[PDB]
Amino acid sequence: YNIADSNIANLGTELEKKVKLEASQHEDAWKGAGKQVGVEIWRIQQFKVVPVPKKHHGSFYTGDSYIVLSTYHPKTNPDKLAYDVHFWLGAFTTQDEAGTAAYKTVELDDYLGGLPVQYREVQGYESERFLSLFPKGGLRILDGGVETGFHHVE
Amino acid sequence: TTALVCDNGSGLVKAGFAGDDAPRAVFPSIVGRPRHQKDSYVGDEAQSKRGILTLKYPIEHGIITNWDDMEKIWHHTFYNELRVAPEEHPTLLTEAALNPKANREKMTQIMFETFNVPAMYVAIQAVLSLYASGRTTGIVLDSGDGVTHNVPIYEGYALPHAIMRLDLAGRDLTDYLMKILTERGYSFVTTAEREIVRDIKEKLCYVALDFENEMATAASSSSLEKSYELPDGQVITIGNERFRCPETLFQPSFIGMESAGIHETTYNSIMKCDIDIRKDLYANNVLSGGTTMYPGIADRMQKEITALAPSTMKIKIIAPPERKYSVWIGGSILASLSTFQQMWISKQEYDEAGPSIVHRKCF
Ligand SMILES: Nc1ncnc2c1ncn2[C@@H]1O[C@H](COP(=O)(O)OP(=O)(O)O)[C@@H](O)[C@H]1O
Ligand SMILES: [Ca+2]
Ligand SMILES: [Ca+2]
Ligand SMILES: [Mg+2]
């Protein structure tokens, strides 16, 4: 095939990155994100990105999906910031929640200039990096969750 | 304001509203005209009257080849199925990767100039399926009625140099089943008869785990045979055609194509990606589309990719039960997000820039 004659000729370009960077400017949840070392968490709630209060960080509803931004100083420079972005998928989260969490993880990555490294964290399969984010006994799974944003077609 | 999501497959229209968990309209992407040469029928009703019609598909191998008939399909989707006024609804369309650029240019032109939609976007099908699976990294094998293609995606970006495409999919498999059923003395020839054989294929075919062993099993006794009742009431029997037909996906030389089979194209696509992400792709093969619904296909894919890959490679085939609708569902999710809608083409932008703007907005 001739990529250049095709509908994927503009994938992988500066233009693609520019358009997606602009789109990420229209999400209120990212404003002020990633400005200091620490952990910031949002939950998908009927397609919206909703902050989780710091007092609840580490407690996750099994029925829900989340975005967890870990901001840290890299080895290369103690005064700069680097990022791991984890999206956490509860065992009982619905398809709309997991898909929104995945898409909005990419968007937050875009917002932060591509710098975050992405991690998909399914309940019970969490990475060593994810387990390391929370103090001893800090990671707790809660029963239930918020309702799906999908309308069910009968 | 509710966006429309329309996944125009080569064989089926899947259409509905963003935020629904399934498409509300699913019907054949066909226009029927009198077989004897009121003017035409579309979709389900063409199928219903197929006894007196010749059926034509405006999409072939994922590409619109009859634009007048595709206009009839879209008109039917909006006004007769969904019963909406398109000028009231932002519309998300879809496309297989590696289509010629003019396909989405003309999609854009018709949506704005004929249907007066307020906004639209053309999405890459395989990317929608990946998000429907809740992933940002993986390699999607999407196979519908028209195209089989492999799209590796890393951290939300498709890797265009590694995308693979085979213009061999469900319709070719139906045609091949029609052909090999002649060996039993059955004669399926007409466009209407193609639809009967398509149904036989969907109901009775499967992918053998070991093709040569299965051919031997089929010759040793009738244990694999199945019966099928034709619309006229005649009952036919089919045997090794059940698995010879989808074997073509693994052996395209069954229909005279020199191409790599779907296991080899998947492997080749992964091998075109940077080595450090290949383990993630091998552990996240996501199947998408109706031609991935054969019983046994995931197990066969697992076996064949294991034979090609490094001996310690962890390999996983993800086969969502809803994967006939994964593309549509991914579109329903993304079209429910205001930031994704921010990227859509507005009618004013189309008025000022024309069809070329689709390449600067839709990724
Ligand atoms: N259970 C099944 N087994 C094998 N093939 C199937 C099955 N269900 C549907 N198909 C085939 O999948 C194709 C339609 O699937 P779909 O993903 O809607 O395709 P498209 O998007 O090209 O219209 C047709 O070729 C159809 O015969
Ligand atoms: Ca939930
Ligand atoms: Ca990144
Ligand atoms: Mg399709």
Q: What was the resolution (in A) of this experimentally determined structure?
A: 1.5
Ligand nearest to the CA of A98: 2
Beta-carbon-side half-sphere exposure of residue B197 (alpha carbons within 13 Å): 26
Backbone phi, then psi, for A121, in 5-degree steps? -120, 100
The two three-digit tokens of residue B128, written as one number: 């929608």
Structural domain contains residue A6: no
CB B33 within 8 A of CB B346: no
Q: Measuring CA to CA, how many Å separate B123 from each of A62, B73, B148, B299?
A: 31, 19, 17, 30
In angstroms, the CA A88 to CA A18 distance is 27
Structural domain contains residue A90: yes
Closest by Cα among B178, B214, B199, B179 to B299: B214
CB A34 within 8 A of CB A71: yes
3-state class of B95 per DSSP? strand
H or E element, residue B323: none
Residues of A in contact with B155 (CB under 8 A): 106, 109, 118
Expressed as residue numbers, the domain containing A81 is 14-142
Q: Which CATH class is domain B170-250?
A: alpha beta
CB B101 within 8 A of CB B65: no
How many other C-beta atoms can be found within 10 angstroms of the C-beta atom of residue A38? 12
Query: How big is the CA angle at B46 (ends B44 and B48), to the nearest 5 degrees?
Result: 70
Structural domain contains residue A8: no
Write the CB contacts of A96 (distance below 8 Å, at least 6 apart in sequence): A44, A47, A148, A149, A150, B21, B332, B333, B336
CB B166 within 8 A of CB B144: no
Cβ burial B206-235 (10 Å sphere, 16+ → b, else e): bbbeebeebbebbeeeeebebeeeeeeeee
Indicate yes or no: CB of B336 within 8 angstroms of CB of A101: no
Q: Which CATH class is domain B4-124+327-361?
A: alpha beta
Indicate yes or no: CB of B360 within 8 angstroms of CB of A98: no
Give yes or no for A120 touching B (CB within 8 A). yes
In angstroms, the CA B10 to CA A103 distance is 27
Write the CB contacts of A102 (distance below 8 Å, at least 6 apart in sequence): A87, A120, B130, B131, B134, B135, B136, B156
The two three-digit tokens of residue B107, written as one number: 């999609």
How many other C-beta atoms can be found within 10 angstroms of the C-beta atom of residue A114? 14
* Chain A from 68 to 97: CB within 8 A of any B CB: 87, 89, 95-96
The two three-digit tokens of residue A60, written as one number: 């996750």
A78 by Cβ neighbours in 10 Å (0-12 / 13-18 / 19+) ranks as exposed
In angstroms, the CA B16 to CA B124 distance is 18
CB A34 within 8 A of CB A47: no
- Relative to beta strand A48-51, strand A38-45 is antiparallel
Structural domain contains residue A3: no
Closest by Cα among B30, B141, B4 to B82: B4
Assign 3-class secondary structure to chain A. CCHHHECCCCCCCHHHHHHHHHHHCCCHHHCCCCCCCEEEEEEEECCEEEECCHHHCCEEECCCEEEEEEEECCCCCCCCCEEEEEEEECCCCCHHHHHHHHHHHHHHHHHCCCCCEEEEEECCCCCHHHHCCCCCCCCEEECCCCCCCCECCC
Residues of B in contact with A120 (CB under 8 A): 134-137
Write the CB contacts of B336 (distance below 8 Å, at least 6 apart in sequence): A47, A96, A100, A149, B3, B18, B19
The two three-digit tokens of residue B109, written as one number: 């032109």
In angstroms, the CA A126 to CA A38 distance is 19
Experimental method: X-ray
3-state class of B273 per DSSP? coil
- Residue from the list B21, B100, B361 with its beta carbon closest to the beta carbon of A152: B21
CB B132 within 8 A of CB B326: yes
Task: Give the sign of the dihedral formed by CA B267, CA B272, CA B278, CA B284.
Answer: negative
For residue B89, the 8-state DSSP code is: S
In angstroms, the CA B295 to CA B301 distance is 12
Q: List all residues whose CB is within 6 A of at least one atom of ligand 1.
A: B 9-12, 144-146, 170-171, 198, 201-202, 205, 289-291, 293-294, 324
How many angstroms does the Cα of residue B230 sit away from the middle of ligand 3? 55
Give yes or no for A48 touching B (CB within 8 A). no
Query: How big is the CA angle at B234 (ends B231 and B42), to the nearest 5 degrees?
Result: 15
Our measurement of the distance from residue B198's CA atom to the centroid of its chain's CA atoms, rounded to an integer in Å, reads 14
**Topology match between the domains B4-124+327-361 and B131-168+260-318:** yes
Cβ burial B337-348 (10 Å sphere, 16+ → b, else e): bebbbebbbbbe
In angstroms, the CA B129 to CA B136 distance is 10
Indicate yes or no: CB of B155 within 8 angstroms of CB of A99: no
For residue B294, the 8-state DSSP code is: S
In angstroms, the CA B330 to CA B177 distance is 32
- Relative to beta strand B317-318, strand B164-166 is unpaired
The protein residue with its alpha carbon nearest to ligand 1, atom 4, reads B202
In angstroms, the CA B34 to CA B211 distance is 42
The two three-digit tokens of residue B349, written as one number: 């932008």
Give chain B's largest Cα–Cα span. 69
- Relative to beta strand B119-124, strand B91-95 is parallel
Domain ranges of chain B: 4-124+327-361, 131-168+260-318, 170-250
The two three-digit tokens of residue B46, written as one number: 């063409």
Closest by Cα among B277, B331, B363 to B97: B363
Give yes or no for A109 touching B (CB within 8 A). yes
Residues of A in contact with B337 (CB under 8 A): 47, 100, 103-104
For residue B271, the 8-state DSSP code is: H
First-residue to last-residue Cα distance in chain B: 23
- Residue from the list B103, B134, B361 with its beta carbon closest to the beta carbon of A98: B134
* Domain count along chain A: 1
Indicate yes or no: CB of A10 within 8 angstroms of CB of B342: no
Chains A and B form CB pairs within 8 A to the count of 142
Annotated binding site of A for Ca(2+): 63-64, 97, 109, 114, 116, 146
CB A82 within 8 A of CB A74: yes
3-state class of B274 per DSSP? coil
Fold of B131-168+260-318: Nucleotidyltransferase; domain 5 (3.30.420)
DSSP string, B126-171: HHHHHHHTT-SSEEEEEE-SS-EEEEEEETTEE-GGG-EEES-SHH
Give yes or no for A123 touching B (CB within 8 A). no
The two three-digit tokens of residue B345, written as one number: 């083409």
Write the CB contacts of A142 (distance below 8 Å, at least 6 apart in sequence): A59, A60, A61, A62
Give chain A's largest Cα–Cα span. 55
H or E element, residue B35: none
CB B16 within 8 A of CB A153: yes
Structural domain contains residue A1: no
- Give the residue from chain B lying closest to A29, CA to CA: B339
Residues of B in contact with A96 (CB under 8 A): 21, 332-333, 336
Candidates B8, B148, B291, B300: which one to mutate for ligand 1, based on the most atoms within 8 Å of Cβ? B291
Give yes or no for B314 touching A (CB within 8 A). no
Beta-carbon-side half-sphere exposure of residue A81 (alpha carbons within 13 Å): 17
Ligand nearest to the CA of A91: 2
Rg (CA), chain B: 21
How many angstroms does the Cα of residue B344 sit away from the middle of ligand 4? 21
How many angstroms does the Cα of residue B277 sit away from the middle of ligand 3? 13
